[PDB]
Symmetry: C2
């Protein structure tokens, strides 16, 4: 497929891998500079950034899911905390200004991963 | 598909759209906050960032292409300059420390879009 995949900053490649692995993300490439973490085609292609702050972080990607609630079942079973302040954290499957619904993962590097539901009434029927 | 797509910063949504449009990127969503530019599944989902510098820019995504040289045919015909210093610019289909070959687009917002060739000897055969 002509497919756009996100290339995000990570300080340690063992610490950021052990965050996403338990959610079903397979480690398909790793050197010292590049690290590909993949749940099907959830392809997070991390670059080695040692001087990054989590608090001043604009960095983000939309994980577009075929069930949005299955990723939220998996996060509360494997260990990611449901909280207003702090990092790492999860916010809930909420109703949005576009069409349907979106949850929000914030990782150890501050990274706002927007969990979108895909539109099965238009995209299948 | 379980598919990871990049969410990048843009200052004007007419100026950054008229950059990618001529390379085959269809404008499928635009409000004031979000802008989706898409060549097949090259889904660049831009957020409105007015205080961004192009020179201090870590922001980046891998465009994984089925011909890498077809995107480089299209850039030199429609108008993107081949140069060492400056922005916007293109660098060439060069040999890399991972497997095959990668070119590099740098846009008006400093954004390092890494143009990867997909691996048809392993992924088809």
């Amino acid at each position: 497929t002509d497919q756009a995949t996100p290339n995000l900053p990570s300080r340690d490649f063992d610490s950021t891998a052990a965050f996403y692995e338990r959610l079903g993300f397979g480690i398909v490439f790793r050197d010292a500079g590049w690290m590909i973490l993949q749940r099907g085609d959830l392809m997070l292609e991390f670059f080695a950034h040692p001087g990054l702050d989590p608090l001043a972080s604009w960095f983000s990607c939309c994980l577009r899911l075929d069930d949005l609630a299955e990723f939220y079942r998996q996060c509360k079973s494997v260990g990611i905390q449901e909280t207003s302040s702090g990092y790492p954290r999860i916010h809930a499957p909420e109703l949005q200004e576009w069409g349907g619904t979106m949850a929000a993962l914030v990782d150890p590097d501050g990274t706002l991963l927007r969990l979108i539901q895909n539109e099965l009434l238009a995209g299948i029927s």
